[PDB]
Amino acid sequence: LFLLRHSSLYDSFYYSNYVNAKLSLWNENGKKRLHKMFARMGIPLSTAQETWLYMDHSIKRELGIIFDKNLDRYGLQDIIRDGFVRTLGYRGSISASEFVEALTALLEVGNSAQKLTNLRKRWVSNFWLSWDALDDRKVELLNRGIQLAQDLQRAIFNTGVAILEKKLIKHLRIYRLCVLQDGPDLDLYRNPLTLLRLGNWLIECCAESEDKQLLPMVLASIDENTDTYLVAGLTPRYPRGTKKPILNNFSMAFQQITAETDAKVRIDNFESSIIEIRREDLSPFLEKLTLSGLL
Amino acid sequence: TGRGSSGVGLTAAVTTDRETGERRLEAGAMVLADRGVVCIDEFDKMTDVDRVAIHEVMEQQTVTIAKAGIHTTLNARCSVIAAANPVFGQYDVNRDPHQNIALPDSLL
Amino acid sequence: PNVSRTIARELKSFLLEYTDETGRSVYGARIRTLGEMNSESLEVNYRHLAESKAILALFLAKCPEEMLKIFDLVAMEATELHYPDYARIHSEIHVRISDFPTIYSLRELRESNLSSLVRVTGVVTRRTGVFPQLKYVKFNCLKCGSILGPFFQDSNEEIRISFCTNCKSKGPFRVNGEKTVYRNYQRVTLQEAPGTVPPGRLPRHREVILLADLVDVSKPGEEVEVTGIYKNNYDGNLNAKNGFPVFATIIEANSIKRREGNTANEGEEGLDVFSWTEEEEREFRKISRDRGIIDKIISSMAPSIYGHRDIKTAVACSLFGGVPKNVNGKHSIRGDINVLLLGDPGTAKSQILKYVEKTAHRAVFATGQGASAVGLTASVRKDPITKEWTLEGGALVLADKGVCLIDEFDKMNDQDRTSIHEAMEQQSISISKAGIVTTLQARCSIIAAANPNGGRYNSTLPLAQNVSLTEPILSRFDILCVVRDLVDEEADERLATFVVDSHVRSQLNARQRRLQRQRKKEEEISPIPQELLMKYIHYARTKIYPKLHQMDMDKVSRVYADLRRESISTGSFPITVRHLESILRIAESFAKMRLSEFVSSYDLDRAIKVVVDSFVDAQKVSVRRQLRRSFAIY
């Protein structure tokens, strides 16, 4: 449960259900089950600057004396962690768990072939305002990413719950395929750093038991012309039990399809886990992939 | 401003008990009008109850009232200035010049 | 004494060890769930009300309240094993009592009734607000210790003394200011509601003193009923009448329920129980994943009317409704859907509006005359002597999701119609006559049952010739459902054989056996009866919010506009920017009943093929040509 010392035990309620998305649900039991463990205290307006800053140490102790009796009985050990922290003398305590979270989102937002140039000049520029974030001189821009981060997850969870309830994940034979053909707010999927997080939420919806077919997914989305389709692959995950050597099989196959016909395929993006495709090529993409078993 | 509540020339017996045992006929609007001028607007856009008051103060210089108290003839030297508008737009020439507002001829 | 200590032990097991109706642990379900909301309430089940009453009725009427104070401290330890640590969180529970066998009203209160459980009705008149109550009197001596513990003060009796257990002098007991918790206290005076009353006479007055977690549950103006006790505490000082050996009554209430309707039941619909957890919610999902539901549901709504389809579909759509959806710093969007019925004097239009009034959760039935323009919306009732010009609502501000009626009060049509067609246009309307300039919120729904001057086809000439209304107030609605029949042999018996069988529809096992008789009598064709059907509506309006797609919406733009062109080139009354906002709305009302948040393709064509035919069929003789148009739309 993150960014707590910065703020929001309120929007913890979403990403407490992320943690219950690691258990057995995404909404159903938890929206009852959370109401044993949370609204025990109504969460204030003024002393909540003091109660979930200071005397939540009475309650972190209380969770510390709640989850010790949720330890031999629940045994879900994704919560207690050793971690690390720093302080500045004043200006609040800021650990490094939440701190990497602000750097990701602030890298995202904070701003023929004529659109990709004006798209590529953006990401270099907004990179630059994150590099100078390591002084004391950035204070009132530090919280800017913080308040940015706790809506982006609320943005990304707004559509993740949609594509679940659409039920367009199909286990064909090997993987599962999902094509986000069109929804709302498609603009936040050009920059690929959000996509691994969307997969990071999506690899954990299928992180139940699943005692056969531990294979990650391949998604699809499009915002711009000529169906650019920044398709990507994920990694399978372990529920804290890596014994088997599971790195990736796709880049071996990514050499294959790129070697076939060169009919508007691109590997110009840097990381090999992301390529591009054409609209009329994604359907013969998978037919080349459902038979080429290279794992 | 010619807003025609009852009080344009009267008292309406407002005393406010004047510290427990004093009743006063408080001057509405004629103690200011004395040896001066007034002006009021919108004659036809009024009720009936002001028109009976402007009858008395024109035929007679004084008002005299006994509401819940004392009959008193207090004097007043007033001079009104009027302002009204015709009713049916620009209909003055194609009809009679008289009755063109048709407020009572008690005032005309 | 001490034997009541065993009594608390003896009842506790007598409560939780048993659950009626084939187990599934009912009393264990109420407790853990109203823990999860943290709201301090419990009930008494009806079938074991009486078996919990039979050996406890002689310990009800003998003492009703001290039995309850010892009844309460066992319910702490009832849940304490289940949920611990309800001590740092408000440390307090107190029980409530469900329905009770008693009919009587305010006219019948004797001296035999007092200090006992009573049930009575009425109408809530003008009330006060919320104050804090002391409730725990820390007494303060001057010389000795000024802390005597937080006491147990009474009701309005002002319990005090001169001197005890410190000294015997006249050093008065005073106050100080730490660690005295406060409950609230809201005195509603009550008038007898002029319903079941031998008429032609006056109302009668009482007093109700509410308690802590029962504050502002009712509103100033509905009808209610209370389940209080009958405490008669006063010193004997009274000042409207002279001093006498006389006492005054005070009803301290224990619970409260709302406006009830169709008082004919025997073992159900007396409490808004509304708890859908293990068996009900598991059931409500599997009733929602079927492939003919919205075809089955709208056939199952009006149980006793064999009429044509579309009027049932629209009146299904009206109480379901879409979304009062939010927007940024810009104009809001109407989240209401308002229908209008045009009919003949003699079809069943006056009954479907009656039937929906019961099946809705809240309603009002302002009909006919007396609908004054100030009377529907808010009014300003004048002050008493030391009071202020306050604001008292009328119909609409009560009815958030209900019903009015405007048919043809021809004289009083020009009076109030300038107050209801600005309730939809300038939605959430309020006003500032001679008082404060505020604006309340009222997202109300309108239905109506207008009546043409004579017959239904008073002309081949169009609707502006038929009704006496003009265009703009008519244009706020979504659809003008119109009826018709001249002569039909087979259709008439389909009513005539249908209607005569309805007139043929004129102890623990026996209370159950009457219910199965009451269940079978509605189940001649078994069209999913009203025992469960209304119960999922209330959370079909307060728990689910739909959303839309983009790729299927633009296919109807030409279907709108080319139908906008034929209706503008040939028109009686026109469609505008208004109607299309209803096109997308009554679409998503249907998909709201799949409980699914999405919009499909299967519904938009269904929603279109409701509107277009129901618009075009009201035109003229020249309707047979337009039916050759609409199958191209289909």
Add this chain to the structure above:
Amino acid sequence: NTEIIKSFKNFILEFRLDSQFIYRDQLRNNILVKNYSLTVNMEHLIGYNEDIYKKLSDEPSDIIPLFETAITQVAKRISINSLPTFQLILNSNANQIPLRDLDSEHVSKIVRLSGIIISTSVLSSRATYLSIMCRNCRHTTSITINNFNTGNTVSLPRSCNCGPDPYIIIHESSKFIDQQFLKLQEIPELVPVGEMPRNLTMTCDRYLTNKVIPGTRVTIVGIYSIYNSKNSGVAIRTPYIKILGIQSDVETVTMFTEEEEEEFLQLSRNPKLYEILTNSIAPSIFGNEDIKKAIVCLLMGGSKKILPDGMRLRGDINVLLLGDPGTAKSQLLKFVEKVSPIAVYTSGKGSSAAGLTASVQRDPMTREFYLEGGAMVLADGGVVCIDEFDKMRDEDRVAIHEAMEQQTISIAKAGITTVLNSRTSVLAAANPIYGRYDDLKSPGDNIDFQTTILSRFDMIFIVKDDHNEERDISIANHVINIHTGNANAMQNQQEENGSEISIEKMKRYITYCRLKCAPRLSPQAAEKLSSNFVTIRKQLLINELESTERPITIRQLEAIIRITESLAKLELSPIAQERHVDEAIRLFQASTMDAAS
């Protein structure tokens, strides 16, 4: 106890972030220009201040002013006697429980409210430093009464060796503080089921009073203590708020910072303001270019001349919108309400038009007749908005005839006859006689008898219904993007950050640009409009001889000069020009033709 005092005098002379030494660097700046006030800031005050508030939560009503005695003892260190005591102002922001949890766990804790303030009382006085005389024994003392439990924190005792209660209040050596009893009202949007809103009461101190006008959004932070008035059952008391600090939004008396006006001057040099606002004002309105320009000039206005004689001109404009239902004259009017500095919305049924302007009633104390209420006196400087000018015939016309054209009312009811000031600006949106027939007959039948209201307003739009087959499909393409998908909320946020202007930026610069510059038109324009009118009247004059009557008279000719003065307030130029004025008539020349057809 004491010594808390030593924990804070040794705390506010050194709290800083990294080498700025802030609280001495503002108290020094605040003892100079006389204000005598503080604020507090962030977390460690919170970090250890809860460790002080874990001994201040028990009674944050008596040891809140134990702060107050401290900072005077650091004040005299920055002097070297005329030294007053100080006051405190706070800050905290997590959320706003509106009016729900108000008796259980919220007696004497710090609360935060969001409300709309409606009613101010007249000022008063309570003391804070007194001098006390025993009667026949002549003791002299002095007691200070700082914070409260309303009156009677402590009393005056019997000990001076003279008689009982011998104590009297001289007025020779005394100080005083003022209280308000202004009333607060719930913001009418947060708890809808079927209810009516409630109300509370509060007081304040002098160096934060008179900071609010009625009709604003506000937020407030303070205590929830309890008094007991003896002018109802058991001994029950009442609730009230003791406020501390209003960290409000803007006033909505022209003092502000400088970086606000820097961007404004950086925007006002780019000469694209007139066309860029029409897209950026109403992000939810398909076009309507002639109407949209009439609204931006209505919001700012012209001027006011008190020219060296007795009379005056009326510097304002007042528009009308009449037309068919379904042409967005309604929902456009809610849009001007939030963007205005001061706006009311009484748009329905007149609301007892005699009680629109004034009300008098009997009084609970002293049984008196004083002035209380009005819709106009609340709405000065800004804009009202009403509708339904067909089915009000009772008093709505007789109430606006005086209220408009001179803006100087005087009530002649049973008490006073006072000419209170008014500088209002009206707006209306009616219906004609079901729309189409007034556009398919002789052009009469608009108002039932009289046109005398119509001569009093200048600008009149008459919209209609076309059937152009390409403009509807775009509209049918428009509103589905704005209904669901909310994709234009992502589109207009994308053209916001370099090209368009959001709502909270438009409000702040209108009050700045109105309250600074004062235009005047150039005498080169005097030949221009004079040559314009003589054929405009003649175009009317050629129409009357064809037996076509109705209306144009000379108020409009002195209304165009306010219209051309309006965009001079927009450009903030102290003159007016010819490309200025030719576009102005281009709005009104367009509305002269529809006055005929």
Add this chain to the structure above:
Amino acid sequence: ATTTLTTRIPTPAIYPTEDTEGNKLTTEYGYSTFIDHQRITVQEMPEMAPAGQLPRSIDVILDDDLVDKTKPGDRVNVVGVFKSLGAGGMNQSNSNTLIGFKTLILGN
């Protein structure tokens, strides 16, 4: 409360009888001196008060030298001392929300 400056010990008395003798006290009223007492409320000059409020008012106690000089409706200009009187907080007990400091002007 008329000496305008010094808050002396008041004499809560109307008229004494029987000074320290056995003589029935007689009072000479020709050599007893009198003075008058008149309060008047003053509104605000309603042009220079900016548009955010109704007119307010305070009051003034004057003496004989300029009584009957003040017709209601005169642009008057007074000057005097500012003065409080009355016991606020002790003359009744518990004294919650009651101002006890009346604004007065004892002027000339």
Add this chain to the structure above:
Amino acid sequence: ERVFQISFFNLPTVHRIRDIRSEKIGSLLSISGTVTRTSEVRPELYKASFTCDMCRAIVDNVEQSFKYTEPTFCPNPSCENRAFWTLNVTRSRFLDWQKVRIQENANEIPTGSMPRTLDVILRGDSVERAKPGDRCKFTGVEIVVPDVTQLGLPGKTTEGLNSGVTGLRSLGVRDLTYKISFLACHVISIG
């Protein structure tokens, strides 16, 4: 559990309301008339067991008369008497009543001469049996009623001119006036 009353009925002679002065005190006189403006149903006492909490408050005192808020006779032990009282709700039976006004019939009114009236207390099972609006008869015991001027907040005509003689009782000097009123026992409505 046993509480009774005595209900006579059917005396021969029926009077009117204008014939009730001198011999009619403590008598039995049937009275006709019509009834208007009822009131509600409150309880009475007739017997209490209140006593002071000095030592023991279990003294069932006497004399629940028209000023009965002071049980102060014969305390239990040698304790402090008339120091308090505690009117419990747990042991003293009550009886329920209502106060109504009557009016003279229409076939007897001589002229339109402001037709006078009087009031009547009905106290047994007679409660809610006089429906307002009928020509009605009554039982007949006449009764006077004072006001004792209790501890409440207060203590044209020369009324109480009789009562100026009624000064100087052992409690405070005042004027206890009187007014003729009516107590009933049994209603009937022939008509």
